[PDB]
């Protein structure tokens, strides 16, 4: 419950930041560019923290089993239950990665290791380039 509690508080503050950026964008007059950058960076790094913390506690979330309350009436709130129950993605993202995979399209494994060696080589090359010139 502790992990889900931390997820709750962090997601609540993320939703609060979203409500903020919403009600300062809803104005008919656009504020200064710098305030928009500050709000963007803060909210976006907060989203990063959301992702990282959700990553950290996957085991606690998975272990939990969902069950409706005995006191909760489904006869009158079945629509509300179904609203939270449904999880299928929005369609546009679906065909989005479908076209993405269409465009992308032992052989695969050796290309994978070739990518490994290119990555390592590029990292070493840029380390050497940084070391070549004194930046301090």
């Amino acid at each position: 419950g502790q992990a889900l509690d931390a997820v709750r508080m962090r997601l609540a503050q993320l939703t609060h930041s979203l409500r903020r950026i919403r009600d300062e964008m809803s104005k008919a007059e656009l504020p200064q560019w710098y305030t928009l950058q500050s709000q963007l960076n803060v909210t976006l790094s907060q989203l990063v923290s959301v992702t990282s913390t959700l990553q950290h506690f996957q085991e606690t979330l998975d272990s939990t089993v969902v069950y409706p309350l005995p006191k909760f009436p489904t006869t009158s709130h079945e629509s509300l239950v179904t609203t939270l129950l449904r999880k299928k993605n929005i369609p546009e993202v679906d065909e989005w990665m479908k076209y993405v995979r269409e465009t992308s399209g032992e052989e695969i494994e050796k290309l994978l290791q070739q990518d490994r060696e290119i990555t390592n080589w590029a990292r070493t090359t840029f380390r050497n380039e940084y070391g070549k010139h004194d930046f301090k």
Binding site: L111, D115, T125, E129, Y130, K132, H133
Partner: protein, 108 residues
Amino acid sequence: MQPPYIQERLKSLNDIETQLCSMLQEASQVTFIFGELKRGNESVKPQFENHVKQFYERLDKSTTQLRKEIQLLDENVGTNKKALGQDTEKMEEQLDLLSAILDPSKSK
């Protein structure tokens, strides 16, 4: 016109921003080339080293030259005034006009 010193100062500054533009352009080409390098054709691999080296050497010496300019600012300290003579020069030209008026052989 301005004294020459300011002229080469502004030339050096213009060179500075042109070098910055060249650095941005070379960043564009290196970002371009890395894409196909990730794609998997090794022909343009040698060009990558040259592009990276030229990009870094363009990034460094530009900042170095700008640092030299800001340093020049440090020792350049200590190194209507025209109005004080302005009326005088006006005076001069007016009398010149009178001369042109005074001589009828020069009014042609």
